[PDB]
Design an enzyme around this catalytic site. Structure first.
Site, short mmCIF file in Angstrom:
data_model
loop_
_atom_site.label_atom_id
_atom_site.label_comp_id
_atom_site.label_asym_id
_atom_site.label_seq_id
_atom_site.Cartn_x
_atom_site.Cartn_y
_atom_site.Cartn_z
N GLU A 60 26.80 42.44 10.07
CA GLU A 60 26.95 42.90 8.71
C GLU A 60 28.22 43.66 8.52
OE1 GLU A 60 25.20 41.42 6.75
OE2 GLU A 60 23.17 41.27 7.40
N1 LIG Z 1 19.83 37.55 13.33
C1 LIG Z 1 20.65 37.64 12.27
N2 LIG Z 1 22.00 37.63 12.45
C2 LIG Z 1 22.77 37.71 11.36
N3 LIG Z 1 22.40 37.80 10.07
C3 LIG Z 1 21.01 37.80 9.91
C4 LIG Z 1 20.22 37.87 8.72
C5 LIG Z 1 20.70 37.95 7.31
O1 LIG Z 1 21.12 36.61 7.47
C6 LIG Z 1 21.77 35.97 6.39
C7 LIG Z 1 22.62 34.86 7.03
O2 LIG Z 1 22.59 33.67 6.19
P1 LIG Z 1 21.93 32.14 6.24
O3 LIG Z 1 20.98 32.12 5.04
O4 LIG Z 1 23.22 31.31 6.05
O5 LIG Z 1 21.17 31.93 7.56
C8 LIG Z 1 22.51 37.21 5.83
O6 LIG Z 1 22.08 37.40 4.48
C9 LIG Z 1 22.04 38.35 6.77
O7 LIG Z 1 21.63 39.45 5.95
N4 LIG Z 1 18.99 37.83 9.08
N5 LIG Z 1 18.86 37.75 10.41
C10 LIG Z 1 20.13 37.73 10.94
#
Ligand SMILES: Nc1ncnc2c([C@@H]3O[C@H](COP(=O)(O)O)[C@@H](O)[C@H]3O)n[nH]c12
Ligand SMILES: *[C@@H]1O[C@H](CO)[C@@H](O)[C@H](O)[C@H]1NC(C)=O
Length: 261
Positions: free
Chosen positions: A175
Site C-alpha cells: 500500500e
Molecule cells: N495480499 C494482498 N497484497 C496486496 N494487496 C492486497 C489487497 C487489496 O488488494 C487490491 C489489489 O487489487 P486486485 O483487485 O487487482 O486483486 C487492493 O485494493 C489492495 O487494497 N488485499 N489483499 C492484498
C-alpha cells in the site's frame, strides 16, 4: 532482478523513502505512464515477480514475494531450522504456486512447507487477526520489526500473529508503494505506533477505481466525480487529476493509451 531489502531494525525516514523509490522503479512498466504517474505492467511482463527481504532488530529475516502486475503479496519465506520455510496462501495453485515455492526456496537447497491456511484478502486477514476492521491493528516500524521476530525461525506461532504481521507488511510495503499518502503517514509517525486513518483505508480500497479514473482523464479532467474520504472520514469530491495526484505513487494497469503527461 535484485531482491529489494529493508532493514526495519535499524531504520531512518530516508532509508524507508529509498526503499519505496526502489520498489517503485523495479515494479513499474518502464514505458507506461499517465499524467506522469508510473503504471505497473500487465501480466505478460518478461519478469513477473518481485522479492522483498525485511529485517528485524533481532537480525532475523522474512522475504515476501509480490506479483509485479498488481503488487500482491502471494506468500513469504523465513530461515527455519537450517531450511528455507515457504508459506503460501491457500488459493495460489499450480503454475503460480510452484514459481513462488521455487523462487522463495530453490530446489537445490533444503526447504519445508508451512501453509498459510487462508487466502490473502483483507476481510480474511482481519478475521484471523481477531478485529472488525484493520484500523484496529496498529502499524509502524517497531511493530514490523517485533512481528518479524515473532515468526522468523519459530517453530510455533499463532494464525492471529501471522495475520497481524501480514496486515502490517502488506500496508507498509504494497500500500505504501501504491500510495505516496500512506508512505507519508509512515514517515510522519516514524518514531511511533499508529492506527491507519480513514483516508488510508479508503485509498487502499479505491486503488483500482483511482487508476482507471486517471487513465481515462481528458486534459486533466476525471470522467466523473470520485468520492473519497478525508483523514477524518468526511467526504472528499475529486474532480481533476491534480487533486489526487499528490497521493498516488503507482497506477494499477489499465489497457489503452492515456495522456502520458
Ligand atoms: N495480499 C494482498 N497484497 C496486496 N494487496 C492486497 C489487497 C487489496 O488488494 C487490491 C489489489 O487489487 P486486485 O483487485 O487487482 O486483486 C487492493 O485494493 C489492495 O487494497 N488485499 N489483499 C492484498
Ligand atoms: C487493449 O487495448 C488495445 C489498444 O486500445 C486494444 O487494441 C485491445 O483490444 C485491448 N485489449 C483488451 C482485452 O480489451
Amino acid at each position: 532482478i535484485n531482491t529489494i531489502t529493508f532493514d526495519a531494525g535499524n531504520a531512518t525516514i530516508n532509508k524507508y523513502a529509498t526503499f519505496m523509490e526502489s520498489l517503485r522503479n523495479e515494479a513499474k512498466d518502464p514505458s507506461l505512464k499517465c499524467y506522469g504517474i508510473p503504471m505497473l505492467p500487465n501480466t505478460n511482463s518478461t519478469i513477473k515477480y518481485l522479492l522483498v527481504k525485511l529485517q528485524g532488530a533481532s537480525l532475523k529475516t522474512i522475504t515476501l514475494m509480490l506479483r509485479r502486475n498488481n503488487l500482491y503479496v502471494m506468500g513469504y519465506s523465513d530461515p527455519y531450522d537450517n531450511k528455507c520455510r515457504y508459506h503460501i496462501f491457500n488459493d495460489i495453485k499450480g503454475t503460480e504456486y510452484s514459481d513462488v515455492e521455487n523462487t522463495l526456496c530453490p530446489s537445490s537447497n533444503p526447504r519445508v512447507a508451512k501453509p498459510i491456511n487462508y487466502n490473502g484478502l483483507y476481510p480474511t486477514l482481519e478475521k484471523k487477526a481477531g478485529v472488525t476492521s484493520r484500523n484496529e491493528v496498529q502499524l509502524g516500524i517497531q511493530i514490523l520489526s517485533s512481528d518479524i521476530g515473532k515468526i522468523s525461525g519459530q517453530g510455533s506461532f499463532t494464525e492471529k500473529i501471522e495475520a497481524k504481521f501480514l496486515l502490517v507488511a502488506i500496508q507498509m510495503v504494497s500500500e505504501a508503494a501504491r500510495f505516496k499518502y500512506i508512505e507519508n503517514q509512515v514517515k510522519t509517525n516514524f518514531n511511533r505506533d499508529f492506527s491507519p486513518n480513514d483516508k488510508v483505508l479508503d485509498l487502499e480500497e479505491n486503488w483500482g477505481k483511482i487508476s482507471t479514473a486517471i487513465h481515462n482523464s481528458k486534459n486533466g479532467a476525471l470522467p466523473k466525480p470520485l468520492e473519497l474520504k478525508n483523514a477524518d472520514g468526511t467526504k472528499w469530491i475529486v474532480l481533476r487529476v491534480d487533486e489526487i495526484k499528490p497521493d498516488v505513487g503507482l497506477l494499477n494497469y489499465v489497457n489503452g493509451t492515456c495522456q502520458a503527461t
